[PDB]
């Protein structure tokens, strides 16, 4: 008499792909509390729903076809198309709540716009901001997830978007984290640039991207002091997928890539759940006050200032 | 570097700077600081390294072009050594390192000429890195580790074997499934005489620190309901509803705003004792009102529980829903592991809410003032309700296997009872006492209850100690005093024995103990003249309740084995329980199993017993040999259980009976598919536990001797060459023979004396005036114990004046003349 | 107290002493250890270790002098302490008591009512009101102080169970030790406890060789068998396990006792050693009394039961505990 509700297989649709609220979550939660919201943000092939399915069930053992979260094809990657569209939906067993996300200023986006304001070219940019917006002010964590080093554009867009939020503030963590690195990125003397550059880039973000999940503590660099950095921000780096002396295989200078996403996965679970409103709320409450506040950020007053100016 | 590999790498350059030396000790600054800023060049010279080194197969032959190279094995080893010790190695540096040693240990017991090799300290400098290096967040260098250690497993000293069993013992539970059979291949790969050993276990006392540690800090009270419904679902109905799992939990339940190592958190045993001390800690918390119902819901469900299980201890014939019936042999470890759980929660909830209503002084955080405040009013329900299921506990413990619950359950009991249920106690207490085998608590129960009749504890108190002849003669006496009539049965003088060292349920238990007493000592004649002896009495005293809870038909097959009589030994295992026999692998065990460690091994014994009958059968390659090999791999696989639940608690010693039972599997399988052509086919057991194990008793010899007698009677049915078990036989005969003596089984030991050399005082005397002097030496020793003095002197004067005339005697003259 | 760090960057703290002479220490801990090696036949068949934990201590010439830290031991007093903290606390809903205090306002009127007075001597004191102000003492502290210590302090019943035994075979070989030596002013601040093993260890060697009872307040008893040390061997007592690891000990030095004597005869004609601070003389005869087993007897040669018996009994009697030194804290 004490069963779980019911087991998740395939994640859904949280949000259609016209910005459109749709609610069909309510029948997997439950009426308990101190729930654990994280986002994810990214570029058009960064690779976004792959880490997502594998941080919320799944293994790279496993094959790309059954993952939680649906991830482009080889038949797409060809044509230059996205494949995550709108906001998906997912909790795991351990009460934990996992949100993708369609990519922001994508072509694809834009080319699928194009054959259906002054001009089709704002709206991509509208739509980017009030995802980003609502992942920060309803998740309590947001992953980044950069293809290349210093897009330096990626910056601006976030803290413009923070600046456009809806709403004794609440700043939910930034991570930043570096797909498809190379062994040239897995070194000390490029990782003081990274987080130099890093913490120069965002002095006034008012978000929490310093002081937590610091992988020099995850025994990534087993020599390396922590007063070598100035200070190391939350950034992670994820690797491209991978008689006795003539079978030694070939060196690649990074840990494997199972090892650094358990790490990641471990670091992304054994974060803080800071309360999110003036009360405390449950799955059921929090779902109710997410859609409320895509509701309002729906018909908001400082999209249309911002609308304006462009 | 790498244009260096032009003269390297050359096929036989006499310069100054040797490229070796340049690449070993030139270059030994880029270890220091340079590889962790600036790995590659680290990785280039010690590949470049490997690549000349692996072309003159590491210079072994050699420890003009011989003499300048007669040290460089030694640099090579003390370099692997020193940079395998170190800590803040990269993977790629790690894994070649790995390789490299692995190379080298595969090499080095390919050579019979290599053997001086092993006593230089670069040797024992390259196995401590090795060891060092293992029990790592990576598995495969575990595996390679695991490896190259059980690739040279002999010709190392104590402490390294020392160490590898505890290496073993604590990777035995591992949330893999290689690591297991790597480790568990190379725990079986160990001799008896170190696996056996009273020796500390470092690994066992770390994991007792780490969870010492936890449970010292505050109350974190982050274990969401949902967690302990899926623990509690787990443990009372064996249905988890989760498909390493507990790792991911313990994540979860972590905080980062707000410290277990990360190298035991892949252990399973330490997340089972965090998970139950969370839910534990999470029940006494929310004052408990668990989602498993209201405060006196919780208590009803675990006092039925318990009820249900101490019922079905009394008679097995129960079929307790969810605790006696399995799916296959997997259910069947996890029904214990449960159990052992369950018990664990209980003692944890007892601890916690008496630190809850008293308190402690630096072990425990004081709670909450509310918690204080709600448990010092309701202690005295709490105190009534734990008074009033101890009874049960006691059983259930015993049941379980864990004495050490019953004997903490039954001295709290006996303290709160201090003004019919007392003598039921005493009984479970001292029973428990002597599976522990501890003599002195129970004289010291014995003494504190002959203030309040209760003179057969001594009996008990005896048997512990390992002397089965006089517990039996007592337990005899002591039912004819208070039964009134004559239940003595044959035995051997009383007096010789000596010299050498009224309620039912106490008759009952009495009974039990002299039928338990006798099979220790494998004696099957005596079992049935004790079984006639009861049968006689109980007819004649119309007890009706006097029943011995032991299976005959199992005593019968244990005997026709024993005797050579395979025929009728097959007749008699066709009525045991379980699959017939050989001629649907997974599910070996039968159903409605009882989660008794001693119902697991008596199956054991039976599957072994089934197999040797079919191999014999079919005997007199593939024919029978396909499912046997198969049956046997199984048996070995199941019969890990118990050695895997020791490690689940800090016990700091594994069971006897089970890893006995363990190696006779083994060396059964290896016997199958090699037909007794490797020395692997033996019993680990030598004379080196005389030494080192004499605080077991002789039971253990038993089962060795047992699977030893069959094969060298199957010898006889080879022609092709064989290994020499002759040796083998009389020496583990011998050592026994020495075990029962010391314990004064005269009996016993006469039977050893009487099989190795191929009831009355004088008998002995009449029957008795490489392991010559040492039989000689035995004879006398067990003469004189026996109480003729002057024969044995006599005896021993007359070995030494032979001994002085032979060639070595050199242990054999000394020793009878100190004795002497 | 300072802190070394060696090779392996391990805290090796130590400690300074001045003025004090610390020769006969380090002959002490010789000895300790000298004794302990006899043991080592004996654990090799037995789960329970026989030791007697010990730390080692170096002079600096005639009155300095450094000795060696022991970490992991807790206190006695401290339970105590902690307990009197929470019943204070626990009354005050619905600082402490020094023990002299404590022990005058039971020990005041008593006298007062008996018909003495407070300026009475201590030697001229009544035997019934001591004993019953000790008796009435004893009703309220409870003996479960350090059996629910150790209980707490454990993780599974295997665990407890070992370190029970650790601790009662421990006690036995302290106990016999000291009362072969003489080791006196063995108050609560003098006895530490190892959490992780169980086993007992020592402080203050200094009042030993039987100068105890000499002092202003002379003790009859040979070692300390308070309430809680009794209680915390379970509930059969002093008869079960501790009573066979005496009777071990007491046979194990007994048939040693060679080398022993030996030993402290070349303690005596020590030029470094000031005894004084024939008396060493009269020691090694009263150590060698004692090992020959004529403790108390013209000429009768006690045995080694009777030896074990007549010392227990002579250290739980409540005549020898209410005639005490206040700060002995013989009520816990
Ligand atoms: C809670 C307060 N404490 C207990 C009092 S403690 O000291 O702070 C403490 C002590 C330990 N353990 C420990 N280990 C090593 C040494 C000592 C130690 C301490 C004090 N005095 C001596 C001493 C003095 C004189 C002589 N010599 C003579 O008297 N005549 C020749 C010999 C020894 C030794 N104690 C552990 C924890 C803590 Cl807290
Ligand atoms: O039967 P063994 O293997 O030869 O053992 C004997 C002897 O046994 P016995 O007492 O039965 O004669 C003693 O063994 P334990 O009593 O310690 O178990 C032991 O010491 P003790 O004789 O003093 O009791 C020692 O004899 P010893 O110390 O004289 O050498 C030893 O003989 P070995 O060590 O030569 O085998
Ligand atoms: N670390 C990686 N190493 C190798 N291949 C990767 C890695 N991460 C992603 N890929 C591959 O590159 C592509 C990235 O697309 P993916 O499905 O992972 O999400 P995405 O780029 O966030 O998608 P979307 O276009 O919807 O924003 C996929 O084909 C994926 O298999
Ligand atoms: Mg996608």
């Known amino acids: 008499k004490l069963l779980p509700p019911e087991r998740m297989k395939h994640s859904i649709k949280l949000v259609d792909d016209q910005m459109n609220w749709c609610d069909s979550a309510i029948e997997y939660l439950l009426d308990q509390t101190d729930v654990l919201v994280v986002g994810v943000l990214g570029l058009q092939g960064t690779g976004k729903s792959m880490v997502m399915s594998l941080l919320s069930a799944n293994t790279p053992e496993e094959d790309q076809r059954t993952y939680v979260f649906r991830a482009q094809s080889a038949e797409m990657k060809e044509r230059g198309g996205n494949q995550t569209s709108g906001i998906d939906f997912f909790i795991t067993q351990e009460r934990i709540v996992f949100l993708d996300t369609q990519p922001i200023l994508s072509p694809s986006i834009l080319d699928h716009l194009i054959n259906n304001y002054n001009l089709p070219h704002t709206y991509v940019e509208m739509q980017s901001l009030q995802i980003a917006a609502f992942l920060f002010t309803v998740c309590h964590v947001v992953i980044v997830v950069q293809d290349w080093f210093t897009d330096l554009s990626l910056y601006r867009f976030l803290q413009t978007a923070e600046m456009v939020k809806p709403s004794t503030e609440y700043y939910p963590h930034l991570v930043f984290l570096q797909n498809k690195a190379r062994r040239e990125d897995f ?111 729906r018909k908001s007053s400082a999209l249309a200032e911002y609308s304006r100016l462009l | 570097l790498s244009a260096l590999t032009t003269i390297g790498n050359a096929k036989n ?20 600081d340079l590889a962790v800023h600036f790995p590659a060049i680290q990785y280039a010279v010690l590949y470049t390294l490997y690549s000349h080194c ?51 240990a595969v090499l080095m017991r390919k050579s019979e000429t290599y053997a001086p090799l092993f006593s230089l300290p670069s040797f024992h400098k390259f196995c401590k890195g090795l060891l060092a290096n293992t029990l790592v967040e990576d598995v495969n260098i575990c595996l390679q580790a695991c490896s190259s250690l059980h690739a040279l497993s002999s010709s190392l000293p104590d402490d390294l074997l020392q160490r590898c ?78 498909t390493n799992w507990l790792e991911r939990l313990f994540y979860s339940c972590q905080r980062l705003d707000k410290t277990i190592p990360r190298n035991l958190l892949k252990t399973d045993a330490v997340l089972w004792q965090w998970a139950i001390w969370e839910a534990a800690q999470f029940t006494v918390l929310s004052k408990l009102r668990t989602p498993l119902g209201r405060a006196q819901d919780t208590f009803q469900t675990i006092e039925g529980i318990i009820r249900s299980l101490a019922a079905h201890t009394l008679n097995p014939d129960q079929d307790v829903s969810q605790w006696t019936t399995a799916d296959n042999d997997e259910g069947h470890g996890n029904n214990q592991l449960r159990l052992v759980l369950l018990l664990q929660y209980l003692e944890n909830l007892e601890k916690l809410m008496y630190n809850a209503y008293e308190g402690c002084a630096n072990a425990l955080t004081s709670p909450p003032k509310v918690i204080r405040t709600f448990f010092y009013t309701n202690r005295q329900t709490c105190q009534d309700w734990l008074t009033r299921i101890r009874l049960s506990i006691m059983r259930v413990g015993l049941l379980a296997g864990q004495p050490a619950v019953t004997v903490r359950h039954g001295f709290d009991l006996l303290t709160e009872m201090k003004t019919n249920e007392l003598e039921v106690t005493i009984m479970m207490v001292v029973e428990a006492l002597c599976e522990l085998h501890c003599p002195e608590a129970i004289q010291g129960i014995a003494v504190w209850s002959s203030s309040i009749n209760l003179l057969w504890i001594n009996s008990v108190a005896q048997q512990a100690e390992g002397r089965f002849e006089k517990a039996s003669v007592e337990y005899q006496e002591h039912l004819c005093a208070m039964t009134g009539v004559d239940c003595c ?70 005997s026709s084995f024993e005797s050579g009589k395979f025929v009728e030994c097959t007749e008699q295992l066709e009525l045991l329980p379980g699959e017939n026999i050989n001629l649907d692998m997974k599910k070996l065990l039968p159903n409605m199993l009882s989660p008794d460690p001693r119902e697991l091994q008596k199956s054991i014994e039976v599957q072994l017993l089934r197999s040797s009958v079919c191999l014999a059968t079919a005997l007199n390659w593939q024919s029978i040999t396909e499912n046997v090999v198969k049956y046997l791999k199984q048996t070995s696989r199941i019969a890990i259980g118990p050695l895997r639940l020791s490690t689940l608690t800090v016990s700091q010693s594994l069971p006897v009976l089970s890893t006995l039972q363990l190696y006779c599997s083994s060396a059964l399988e290896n016997t199958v598919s090699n037909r007794l052509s490797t020395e692997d086919c033996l019993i680990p057991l030598f004379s080196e536990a005389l030494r080192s194990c004499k605080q077991h008793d002789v039971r253990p010899w038993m089962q060795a001797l047992r699977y030893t007698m069959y094969q060298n009677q199957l010898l006889e049915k080879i022609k092709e060459q064989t290994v020499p078990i002759r040796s083998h036989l009389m020496e583990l005969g011998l050592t026994a023979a020495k075990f029962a003596r010391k314990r004064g089984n005269v009996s016993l030991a006469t039977r050893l004396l009487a099989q190795c050399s191929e009831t009355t005082a004088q008998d002995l005397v009449q029957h008795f005036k490489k392991w010559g002097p040492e039989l000689d030496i035995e004879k006398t020793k067990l003469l004189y114990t026996a109480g003729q003095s002057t024969h044995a002197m006599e005896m021993l004067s007359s070995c030494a004046i032979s001994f002085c005339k032979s060639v070595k005697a050199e242990y054999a003259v000394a020793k009878s003349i100190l004795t002497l | 107290k300072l802190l070394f760090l060696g090779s392996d960057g391990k805290s090796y703290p130590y400690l300074f002493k001045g003025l004090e002479d610390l020769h006969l220490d380090e002959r002490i801990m010789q000895f300790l250890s000298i004794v302990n090696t006899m043991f080592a036949t004996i654990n090799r068949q037995e789960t329970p270790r026989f030791h007697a934990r010990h730390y080692s201590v170096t002079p600096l010439g005639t009155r300095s002098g450094l000795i060696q830290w022991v970490d992991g031991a807790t206190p006695l007093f401290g339970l105590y302490k902690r307990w009197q903290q929470r019943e204070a606390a626990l009354q005050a809903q619905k600082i402490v008591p020094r023990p002299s205090e404590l022990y005058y306002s039971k020990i005041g009127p008593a006298l007062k009512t008996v018909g003495l007075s407070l300026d009475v001597s201590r030697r001229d004191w009544p035997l019934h009101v001591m004993k019953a102000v000790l008796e009435e003492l004893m009703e309220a502290t409870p003996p479960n102080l350090l059996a629910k210590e150790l209980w707490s302090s454990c993780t599974t019943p295997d665990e407890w169970w070992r370190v029970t035994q650790s601790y009662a075979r421990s006690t036995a070989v302290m106990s016999m030790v000291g009362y072969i030596i003489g080791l006196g002013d063995r108050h609560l601040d003098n006895v530490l406890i190892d959490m ?40 059969t007592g002093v008869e079960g396990v501790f009573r066979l690891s005496c009777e071990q000990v007491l046979h194990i030095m007994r048939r040693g006792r060679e080398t022993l004597l030996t030993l402290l005869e070349a303690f005596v004609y020590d030029p470094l050693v000031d005894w004084t601070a024939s008396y060493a003389v009269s020691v090694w005869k009263r150590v060698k009394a004692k090992l020959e087993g004529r403790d108390v ?36």
Not at chain 2, 14 to 32: C, D, E, G, Q, R
Not at chain 2, 171 to 176: D, T
Not at chain 3, 306 to 323: P, R
């Open chain 3, 297 to 332: 007897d013209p000429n009768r040669r006690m045995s080694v039961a009777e030896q074990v018996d007549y010392v227990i009994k002579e250290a739980t009697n409540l005549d020898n505990l209410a005639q005490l030194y206040e700060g002995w804290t013989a009520w816990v």
């Open chain 3, 196 to 235: 992780t093993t169980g086993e007992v260890v020592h402080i203050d060697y200094n009042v030993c060789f039987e100068k105890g009872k000499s002092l202003r307040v002379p003790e009859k008893v040979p070692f300390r068998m308070t309430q809680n040390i009794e209680t915390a061997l379970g509930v």
């Open chain 2, 13 to 32: 350059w006499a310069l100054s700077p040797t490229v070796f030396a340049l690449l070993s000790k030139n270059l030994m600054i880029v270890h220091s």
């Open chain 2, 165 to 242: 069993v505890d290496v073993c013992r604590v990777q035995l539970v591992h949330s893999g499934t290689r690591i297991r059979q790597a480790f568990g291949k190379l725990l079986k790969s160990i001799p008896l005489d170190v696996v056996l050993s009273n020796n500390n276990h470092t690994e066992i006392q770390e994991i007792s620190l780490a969870l010492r540690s936890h449970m010292s800090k505050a109350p974190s009270n982050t274990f969401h309901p949902q967690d302990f419904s899926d623990v509690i679902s787990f443990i009372l109905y064996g249905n988890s509803h989760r």
């Open chain 2, 54 to 104: 692996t072309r003159h197969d590491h210079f072994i032959s050699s420890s003009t072009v011989t003499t300048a190279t007669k040290k460089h094995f030694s640099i090579i080893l003390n370099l692997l050594g020193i940079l395998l010790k170190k800590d803040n190695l990269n993977q790629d540096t790690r894994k070649l390192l790995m390789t490299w040693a692995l190379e080298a």
């Open chain 1, 187 to 297: 070194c000390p003397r490029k990782l003081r640039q990274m987080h130099l550059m890093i913490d120069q880039l965002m002095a006034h973000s008012h978000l929490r991207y310093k002081g937590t999940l610091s992988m020099l503590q995850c025994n990534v660099f087993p020599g390396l002091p922590p007063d070598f950095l100035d200070s190391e921000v939350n950034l992670f780096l994820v690797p491209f997928m991978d008689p006795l002396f003539s079978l030694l295989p070939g060196y690649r200078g990074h840990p494997s890539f199972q090892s650094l996403v358990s790490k990641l996965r471990s670091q992304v679970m054994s974060m803080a759940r800071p309360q999110l409103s003036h009360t405390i709320l449950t799955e059921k409450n929090w779902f109710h006050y997410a859609a409320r506040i895509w509701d309002g950020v």
């Open chain 2, 489 to 558: 049965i044959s035995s051997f003088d009383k007096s010789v024995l000596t010299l050498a060292n009224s309620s039912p349920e106490v008759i009952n238990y009495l009974g039990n103990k002299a039928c338990e007493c006798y099979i220790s000592i494998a004696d099957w004649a005596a079992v049935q003249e004790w079984q006639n002896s009861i049968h006689d009495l109980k007819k004649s005293t119309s007890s009706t309740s006097l029943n011995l809870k032991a299976d005959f038909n199992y005593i019968k097959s244990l």
